[PDB]
A paper describes a structure:
The [name]ΔMAT8I construct lacks most of the globular domain of MA (residues 15 to 100) and p6. The [name]ΔMAT8I protein, however, was not soluble when released from bacteria owing to its self-assembly into spherical particles inside the bacterial cells. We, therefore, purified [name]ΔMAT8I assemblies directly from lysed bacterial cells. Upon iterative refinement, the final density maps of the [name] hexamer from [name]ΔMAT8I assemblies in the absence and presence of IP6 and GagT8I VLPs were obtained at 4.2 Å, 4.2 Å and 4.5 Å resolution, respectively. The SP1 helix in the [name]ΔMAT8I map is complete and extends to the SP1 and NC interface, therefore allowing model building of the C-terminal portion of SP1, from T8I to M14. Intriguingly, we observed a strong density above the six-helix bundle. This density is coordinated by two lysine rings formed by residues K158 and K227 (K290 and K359 in [name] amino acid numbering) near the bottom of the CACTD and above the bundle. Considering that [name]ΔMAT8I assemblies were produced in E. coli cells, it seems unlikely that the density in [name]ΔMAT8I map is IP6 (left). When the same [name]ΔMAT8I assembly is incubated with a buffer containing 10 μM IP6, this internal density is present at lower position resembling that seen in GagT8I VLPs. It is plausible that a small anionic molecule other than IP6 assists in the charge neutralization of the lysine rings and promoted assembly in E. coli-expressed [name]ΔMAT8I. Radial density profiles from three different particles of similar size displayed three distinct peaks corresponding to the CANTD, CACTD and NC-RNA density layers. While CANTD, CACTD and SP1 are rigidly connected as seen in the [name]ΔMAT8I map, NC-RNA is flexibly linked to SP1, resulting in a smeared density in [name]ΔMAT8I subtomogram averages.
Author numbering:
A (entry chain I), B (entry chain D), C (entry chain E), D (entry chain O), E (entry chain J): 146 to 378
Amino acid sequence: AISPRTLNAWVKVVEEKAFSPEVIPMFSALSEGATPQDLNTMLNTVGGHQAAMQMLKETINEEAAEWDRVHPVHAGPIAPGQMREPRGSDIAGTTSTLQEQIGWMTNNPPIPVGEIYKRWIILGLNKIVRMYSPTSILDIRQGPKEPFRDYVDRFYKTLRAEQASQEVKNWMTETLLVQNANPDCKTILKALGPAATLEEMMTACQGVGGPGHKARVLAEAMSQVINSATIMM
Amino acid sequence: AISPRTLNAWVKVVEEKAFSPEVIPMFSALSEGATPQDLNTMLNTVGGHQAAMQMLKETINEEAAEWDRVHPVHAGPIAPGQMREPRGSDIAGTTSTLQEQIGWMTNNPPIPVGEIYKRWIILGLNKIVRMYSPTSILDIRQGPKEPFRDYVDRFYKTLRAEQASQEVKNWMTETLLVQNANPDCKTILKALGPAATLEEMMTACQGVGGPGHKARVLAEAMSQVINSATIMM
Amino acid sequence: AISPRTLNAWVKVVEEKAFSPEVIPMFSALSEGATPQDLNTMLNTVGGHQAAMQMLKETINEEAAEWDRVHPVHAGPIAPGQMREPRGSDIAGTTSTLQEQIGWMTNNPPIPVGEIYKRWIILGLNKIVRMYSPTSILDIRQGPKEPFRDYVDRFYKTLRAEQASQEVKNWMTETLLVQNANPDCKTILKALGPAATLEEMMTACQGVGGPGHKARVLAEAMSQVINSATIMM
Amino acid sequence: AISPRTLNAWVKVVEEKAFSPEVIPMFSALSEGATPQDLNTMLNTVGGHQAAMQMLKETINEEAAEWDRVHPVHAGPIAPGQMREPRGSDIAGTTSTLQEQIGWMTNNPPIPVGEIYKRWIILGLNKIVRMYSPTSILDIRQGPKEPFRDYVDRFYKTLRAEQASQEVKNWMTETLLVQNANPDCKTILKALGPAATLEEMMTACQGVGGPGHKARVLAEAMSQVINSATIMM
Amino acid sequence: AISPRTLNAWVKVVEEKAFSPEVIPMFSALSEGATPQDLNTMLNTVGGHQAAMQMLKETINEEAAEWDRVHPVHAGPIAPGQMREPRGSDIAGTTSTLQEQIGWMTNNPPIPVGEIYKRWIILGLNKIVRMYSPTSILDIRQGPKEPFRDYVDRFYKTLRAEQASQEVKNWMTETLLVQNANPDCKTILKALGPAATLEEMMTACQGVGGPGHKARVLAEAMSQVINSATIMM
């Protein structure tokens, strides 16, 4: 088996870092000579980022289907002993036991089912590294035509998944949320001093995008125009 | 035994949160009916914060000494079977095996050594909650008379332990480090636009605190005084 | 065993590069299927950087303690043959021989003690990669209030460990040492032309920081002030 | 054996990326426990970049020679069975069969010839990573004194090896080729609007470097001089 | 045999220092009483500087030929025992084994083949010390009529072999490359501030040496002449 601190360190590295091309080294290093059951154990222990786990699990099942497609199940009628060759269904450890897993790995010849599963998972992780883009708290920005309340609601929504301590989150919430708004709601949210709370702020920019507010802004632009349309009249 | 995802979730909660008075509930909940060996396993799996682990381990050994002090070791000469009562040395699982641990917990009467160890660890964690103060990246501030280079060196030194992703750290390094300096080095670091790197910044404030710089500042103050010492002359 | 050129190439890569997250790949690649004794051999062959070797050796001994804590030593009374299971003390190859090491690795089942030691060392190297910061000759800068002689003494002190050829070191000594001084000693060291030696330079800035020199500088600042304090009188 | 999709993914990574220090991880990961024949198979499947393949093949043969130099061929007269030890000639799989390869890898003790070949290939790939410099389409620039026609001929010559789709290549051919010419031919190629084809362009700059053209340019420079040599006369 | 740290220290001294007349002492000291096979082992472990290794290997083979020329191979028909005298072919350890090497060195009289090989290698190293000139990064200078791009290409080409750490190389690349150019390209590369990258620099001096640029420079010289050719007209 594998020691719990190894699994914790590996998962620490997976949370701690964004998708990057160097995950495979650390994975192959820590997951050394393990058994397939333990590898799937190591797989489902990842927390969050289930989006990519979708594609990963999919490339696994696809390789499983292809190994099935290459290998025939013809066997018998030998009396039960070393009962079949492995199957793309069980190489991933879905329908087989640790006992059966050992009876594969210590028997001669040692068919390295674990190694094959490792190879597949590496292929998958590579494809993932190519097909992902890490999301942060830093990128979340207000759309140009977007109700401010929904903006804050998405802000907190993704913020709750951010991996940091408490006080970081507080100061984060204080600096970026206001800083990253559109110019339209910023030029009103920032006139009101940075002492009010999210409630007063919400009630402040609640008018943006509406007809009364668009009127106001258009009138201010037109008045600034005509002020000099008439300096010379 | 305990399932690996339980240990990962508990440790996730311990890293993710600062010392707070509510850790004990979650700990007692997850660490339910476990065996002492597993509890110590759950203990040493914590990563970082070894400072408090010092005091924790100490309160454990102190309770162990006191349980020793209360319980006598007189026993025998019964032939080997259920060989002794437990000991403050082994209740913490230092000199006993999982086998011996079971031979304690399933035998009648079930002396709940695990429960006692749980009680001690709870006492300890409580004392820790009282005697700690969480450190952040947010608190690190420049001393009033402090070489700026050492300031940045401590900044990064504690920054490397911060528990967050990559791009957070980058923007962190860009905003707080400059913002949190003393007024003396700030009024020179901030005159130079926020486009230069840490090297140019370092070479800029390298003069602060020195005699040539103290001269400069004193002369500017005195000149501003005398400018009006003489407006009226 | 391992061939000497492999060890030389690996150590070449370790000296040649600063701490970086990609050391583990090359290490696991070169240190392939080796025996634990050879791995420790590969460990102590590193030259310099003993600071991190402290922490590395420590994480090894800690994993060793934990493997001890998990595995019981109960065994016997079988007559001597395959005499015990390995121990966290000897898995690192402290109290065991190459003979005993082989008698572990070629026997059935092959308990891959070497692989386990590899796993531990990888864990350690990773933790090192996180907890280090490479020092260079390039960073060494004069403190703001620092006797120039001690500055040069530290310069050479760390310079002697720099990994380069002779003439590089010479030109290094000529350009950075003077360039990286504080403005106070620079404005005197650089008035004296770049033809004098370290001795004349030392005798030149020997006055900085002292009361006579602070007087001089303060008087020059005050005189420049009063020159225009009186242009208008 | 190895599955074809693994080989395709590995070769995809090798084409897709320039020489970089992280190829070894992915290589060792995918090429796991394989047989030497398969490793050489994986070697010659690389497409293009044969230049470095020269040096790679050379470091392999050199290690082979050295292993020969260390290991004696004395053996016999045992009747044929496990017939010799391997040889630096056949460890690389030149003069041995897959059958003989298996008769090495499954026999006791399993002499890991494949692992040794892996070690050599890793050494080689590392040396390659050090001794290469990736060429692009982006670097190709006109020499200062260079017939424009040869410039375009080299442009296309290396362009045909670029690894991209069709329309990319078209727009590439339209923007960089003209942009990257020398000022001399650019100041004539760019006066003619960007609507003419490569033929008209070729006929345009065909005069550069020649005596008639050098005359023209020298006369224009001299005339611009004398225009003000005489403003004041 | 020889201990690996001895070989590493010797090779450290060989890389670390340029060709100098004092290598022989350290070599003879470390390579003490060794066996010829180990000496050749110590020879091919040198990394880089293969140029001189050519001449070295050549003087070895020449001494080997001469020892052949002096010593006759007549021997026999004694039954196999201490089978021949050594040969200039095998004294260098090309066609002999460590076993045969021992059967030479421990037999009476001990023909010190290793000592003779040592003598030859010393002769060779001496001749090398005379016939070499160390190349540095420091000497690389731009030819007077040389396309700047090729200049940078050679700069990096030899730079990649320099034996130093990362940040040294960076600052090296920043200071010497620009400093060491010809006056012609320097007076344009240095007018553009030291903030642009190698790409902008390349595009800047791409015009040098060409007819348009030679025109420009000649016109500026002639105009400066005529400015005073006419002050007095």
